Design an enzyme around this catalytic site. Structure first.
Site, mmCIF file in Angstrom:
data_model
loop_
_atom_site.group_PDB
_atom_site.id
_atom_site.type_symbol
_atom_site.label_atom_id
_atom_site.label_comp_id
_atom_site.label_asym_id
_atom_site.label_seq_id
_atom_site.Cartn_x
_atom_site.Cartn_y
_atom_site.Cartn_z
ATOM 1 N N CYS A 140 0.812 -1.216 0.000
ATOM 2 C CA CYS A 140 0.000 0.000 0.000
ATOM 3 C C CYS A 140 0.847 1.268 0.000
ATOM 4 C CB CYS A 140 -0.940 0.012 1.189
ATOM 5 S SG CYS A 140 -2.426 0.868 0.756
ATOM 6 N N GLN A 148 0.112 16.289 -1.063
ATOM 7 C CA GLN A 148 0.077 15.647 -2.384
ATOM 8 C C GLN A 148 0.504 16.560 -3.501
ATOM 9 O OE1 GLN A 148 -3.682 12.527 -1.710
ATOM 10 N NE2 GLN A 148 -3.789 14.213 -3.192
ATOM 11 N N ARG A 149 0.834 15.953 -4.640
ATOM 12 C CA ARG A 149 1.278 16.666 -5.845
ATOM 13 C C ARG A 149 2.570 17.458 -5.633
ATOM 14 N NH1 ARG A 149 -4.182 16.733 -5.102
ATOM 15 N NH2 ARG A 149 -3.835 18.531 -3.716
ATOM 16 N N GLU A 174 1.285 -4.047 -5.141
ATOM 17 C CA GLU A 174 0.088 -4.876 -5.106
ATOM 18 C C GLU A 174 -0.848 -4.393 -6.216
ATOM 19 O OE1 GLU A 174 -0.351 -6.306 -1.106
ATOM 20 O OE2 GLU A 174 -2.539 -6.190 -1.253
HETATM 21 C C1 LIG Z 1 -0.094 -0.550 -4.660
HETATM 22 C C2 LIG Z 1 -1.252 0.149 -4.047
HETATM 23 O O1 LIG Z 1 -1.688 -0.189 -2.979
HETATM 24 S S1 LIG Z 1 -1.948 1.423 -4.847
HETATM 25 C C3 LIG Z 1 -2.692 2.588 -3.739
HETATM 26 C C4 LIG Z 1 -2.747 3.995 -4.354
HETATM 27 N N1 LIG Z 1 -2.924 5.072 -3.372
HETATM 28 C C5 LIG Z 1 -3.990 5.881 -3.245
HETATM 29 O O2 LIG Z 1 -4.876 6.017 -4.079
HETATM 30 C C6 LIG Z 1 -4.068 6.670 -1.958
HETATM 31 C C7 LIG Z 1 -4.323 8.149 -2.246
HETATM 32 N N2 LIG Z 1 -3.334 8.718 -3.148
HETATM 33 C C8 LIG Z 1 -2.191 9.280 -2.726
HETATM 34 O O3 LIG Z 1 -1.819 9.214 -1.558
HETATM 35 C C9 LIG Z 1 -1.346 10.018 -3.756
HETATM 36 O O4 LIG Z 1 -2.141 10.777 -4.689
HETATM 37 C C10 LIG Z 1 -0.374 9.103 -4.519
HETATM 38 C C11 LIG Z 1 0.312 8.115 -3.588
HETATM 39 C C12 LIG Z 1 -1.128 8.351 -5.600
HETATM 40 C C13 LIG Z 1 0.702 9.950 -5.165
HETATM 41 O O5 LIG Z 1 1.445 10.706 -4.203
HETATM 42 P P1 LIG Z 1 1.863 12.211 -4.591
HETATM 43 O O6 LIG Z 1 2.993 12.723 -3.735
HETATM 44 O O7 LIG Z 1 0.603 13.050 -4.652
HETATM 45 O O8 LIG Z 1 2.369 11.950 -6.105
HETATM 46 P P2 LIG Z 1 3.597 12.754 -6.734
HETATM 47 O O9 LIG Z 1 3.461 14.222 -6.380
HETATM 48 O O10 LIG Z 1 4.842 12.005 -6.296
HETATM 49 O O11 LIG Z 1 3.442 12.608 -8.351
HETATM 50 C C14 LIG Z 1 2.354 11.955 -9.043
HETATM 51 C C15 LIG Z 1 1.506 13.056 -9.692
HETATM 52 O O12 LIG Z 1 2.272 13.791 -10.653
HETATM 53 C C16 LIG Z 1 1.650 13.765 -11.945
HETATM 54 N N3 LIG Z 1 2.628 13.648 -13.071
HETATM 55 C C17 LIG Z 1 2.348 13.822 -14.367
HETATM 56 N N4 LIG Z 1 3.455 13.654 -15.127
HETATM 57 C C18 LIG Z 1 4.482 13.371 -14.312
HETATM 58 C C19 LIG Z 1 5.939 13.080 -14.456
HETATM 59 N N5 LIG Z 1 6.565 13.053 -15.663
HETATM 60 N N6 LIG Z 1 6.637 12.836 -13.321
HETATM 61 C C20 LIG Z 1 6.042 12.858 -12.110
HETATM 62 N N7 LIG Z 1 4.738 13.111 -11.931
HETATM 63 C C21 LIG Z 1 3.920 13.373 -12.964
HETATM 64 C C22 LIG Z 1 0.644 12.619 -11.875
HETATM 65 O O13 LIG Z 1 -0.486 12.873 -12.734
HETATM 66 C C23 LIG Z 1 0.247 12.594 -10.413
HETATM 67 O O14 LIG Z 1 -0.726 13.620 -10.207
HETATM 68 P P3 LIG Z 1 -2.256 13.377 -9.755
HETATM 69 O O15 LIG Z 1 -2.039 13.018 -8.302
HETATM 70 O O16 LIG Z 1 -2.995 14.674 -9.985
HETATM 71 O O17 LIG Z 1 -2.799 12.327 -10.693
#
Ligand SMILES: CC(=O)SCCNC(=O)CCNC(=O)[C@H](O)C(C)(C)COP(=O)(O)OP(=O)(O)OC[C@H]1O[C@@H](n2cnc3c(N)ncnc32)[C@H](O)[C@@H]1OP(=O)(O)O
Ligand SMILES: [Zn+2]
Length: 264
Positions: A140, A148-149, A174
């Site tokens: 997870c 975030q972001r 996963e």
């Molecule tokens: C294996 C599993 O269990 S899956 C579980 C998935 N987790 C969840 O859904 C829980 C809730 N989500 C979160 O906590 C977060 O949104 C996460 C974990 C998905 C991402 O963490 P964040 O720190 O926000 O992501 P981070 O800032 O590292 O970068 C990803 C974002 O950059 C964007 N991005 C676009 N192009 C790029 C690029 N070239 N490089 C990096 N990032 C990019 C992505 O679209 C994504 O944005 P979004 O969140 O609006 O879709």
């Protein structure tokens, strides 16, 4: 839902989904939490007071990594359960599907914190099953909304490989991925594949592009298939664009020199 709003340290976060947080609690319109011990309370006052107690100002385990402001604590499900238990409750507020809450002991919890005078503040974590049903480097992953972001996701993602990296045991997340997670990986693999293209003007392998990376062959290939680079194929004009992109403002990147961790 169960519930709508919570108050973490200072910030008020609007939940995405329900979480088991006991009926008696869930019902309450807002759920005050305590930044550190992650204990759910019923009111701002009950919270506000409890904070004089505690004395917890950072996660339970040992710091495996500390560079600049960011740090990760490898919290064992067994050693310090209730915390992990509460981490899951907090986490589920932002994961549509999340099994496992009470049965934390089988997992290790790696929590990322951003540190200052007031303490080592939870910014998010990821999960990992001790002994794996499927070789599964991530069970997870979550980053709290207010953070975030900002590249913390990739950081954690990346960290998760460095772990399995020096295990020699290349894993993968996963695979029933959330929508948000899906993009997080899809886009992480890209960056990390297009990474090596510019960092090796020599050409080699896919299984080598693995190991030296850890993004398992099934993936990264599916990544390249999602690209204009499927073929087991270099697009020098893109591999350029991205390494050119990085040079604008780098990440908040994991420094493998700054991690104290022995596998197994
Ligand atoms: C294996 C599993 O269990 S899956 C579980 C998935 N987790 C969840 O859904 C829980 C809730 N989500 C979160 O906590 C977060 O949104 C996460 C974990 C998905 C991402 O963490 P964040 O720190 O926000 O992501 P981070 O800032 O590292 O970068 C990803 C974002 O950059 C964007 N991005 C676009 N192009 C790029 C690029 N070239 N490089 C990096 N990032 C990019 C992505 O679209 C994504 O944005 P979004 O969140 O609006 O879709
Ligand atoms: Zn507390």
């Amino acid at each position: 839902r169960c519930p709508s709003v919570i108050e973490f340290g200072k910030y008020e976060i609007h939940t995405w989904y329900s979480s088991p947080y006991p009926q008696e609690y869930s019902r309450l319109p807002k759920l005050y939490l305590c930044e550190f011990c992650l204990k759910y309370m019923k009111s701002r006052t009950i919270l506000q007071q409890h904070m004089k107690k505690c004395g917890w100002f950072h996660p339970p385990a040992n710091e495996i990594y500390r560079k600049n402001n960011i740090s990760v604590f490898e919290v064992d499900g067994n050693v310090s359960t209730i915390y992990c238990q509460n981490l899951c409750l907090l986490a589920k507020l932002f994961l549509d599907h999340k099994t496992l809450y009470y049965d934390v002991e089988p997992f290790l919890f790696y929590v990322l914190t951003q540190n200052d005078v007031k303490g080592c503040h939870l910014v998010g974590y990821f999960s990992k099953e001790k002994h794996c049903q499927q070789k599964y480097n991530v069970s997870c992953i979550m980053i709290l909304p207010q953070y975030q972001r900002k590249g913390y996701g990739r950081f954690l993602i990346d960290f998760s490989y460095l772990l399995s990296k020096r295990e020699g045991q290349a894993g993968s997340p996963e695979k029933p991925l959330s929508d948000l997670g899906r993009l997080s990986y899809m886009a992480y693999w890209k960056s990390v594949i297009l990474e090596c293209l510019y960092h090796q003007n020599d050409k080699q392998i896919s299984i080598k592009k693995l190991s030296k990376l850890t993004g398992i062959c099934p993936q990264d290939i599916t990544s390249t298939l999602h690209h204009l680079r499927m073929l087991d194929r270099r697009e020098k004009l893109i591999q350029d664009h991205m390494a050119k992109l990085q040079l604008n403002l780098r990440p908040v990147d994991v420094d493998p020199e700054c991690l104290r961790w022995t596998p197994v």
